[PDB]
């Protein structure tokens, strides 16, 4: 595993992401739900604290929530159960 460092939309590499879940569809739904969670954490920050938490990893200067979710995925910071 000696790939050159990725950049932009391909960070983290999807092949290392796929080892965490079964298929890429599971990755899609994983990251979508987690990014939604992060988004409404950002929305529900002004009022009282509720059950939502995150982002567990430190985001960038300005970073889209989905990128944060996928980076959290790659850092082994979540777990799940399918249907």
């Amino acid at each position: 595993g000696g790939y050159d460092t990725p950049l932009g939309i391909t960070n983290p590499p999807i092949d290392e992401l796929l080892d965490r879940v079964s298929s890429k569809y599971a990755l899609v739904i994983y990251a979508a739900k987690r990014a939604r969670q992060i988004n409404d954490y950002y929305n529900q920050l002004g009022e009282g604290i509720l059950e939502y938490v995150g982002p567990l990893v430190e985001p960038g200067l300005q970073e889209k929530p989905l990128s944060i979710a996928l980076r959290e995925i790659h850092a082994d910071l979540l777990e799940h159960t399918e249907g």
């Binding site: 938490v53 995150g54 567990l56 910071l77 979540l78 777990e79």
Partner: peptide, 7 residues
């Protein structure tokens, strides 16, 4: 659980 405790 580990990172929820970390937070």
């Amino acid at each position: 659980e580990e990172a929820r405790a970390a937070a």
